[PDB]
């Protein structure tokens, strides 16, 4: 899944 700071 995506990193804590992605998007």
């Amino acid at each position, epitope marked *: 899944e995506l990193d*804590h700071w*992605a998007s």
Partner: antibody
Amino acid sequence: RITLKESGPPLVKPTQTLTLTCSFSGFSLSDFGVGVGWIRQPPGKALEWLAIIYSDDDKRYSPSLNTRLTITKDTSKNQVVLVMTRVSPVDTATYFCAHRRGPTTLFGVPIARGPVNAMDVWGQGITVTISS
Amino acid sequence: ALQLTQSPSSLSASVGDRITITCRASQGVTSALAWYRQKPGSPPQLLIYDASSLESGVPSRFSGSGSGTEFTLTISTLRPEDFATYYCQQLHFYPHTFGGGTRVDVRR
């Protein structure tokens, strides 16, 4: 100045539980978006990511080790603990904890996320041998 | 999961050379990539964060570029302390993968 240091048993026997402590200074795990992660390095091998925990208490684990890892923090003692259960010989490695910056803020407003893309300060590492 | 492949795995060079190490990801990781240098017996040390930003206190001969799936670290003028192993790390997807490393040793 940020510094981290790992502590725990240098020797552990197969099937046992390994508890590693990362004690740090220079930042608080209550600071905005900060993270502390754990990475290991078997002798002569590559670095392997294990887990990380952030100040808002979100936790993430390596999928390959998920079932054997627990990471937790003790904000008031400035420590992060990683518990690995059921160790076996392949878990012998040098274990490092490391700091991860949170986004830069301006008047308490997040304005730059580029600084979170790295683990910027590392502890010296603690060597753990798993043998009966 | 996501794969990070470093090239070359090993590289020989001499003081004063310009070297470049590359790291390729199996899926795009945007700019969330970091480079480290690790000397024998020591922990890895951060050189470049966010694909190209120079970490504070790190000498200017180190440079990082690229985004997406292909990144490169170049050391413009190799110094003796640079004979070491370099690693790239992706921080876009969990788990936060490391490449296999590239060993830089004294050419002869």
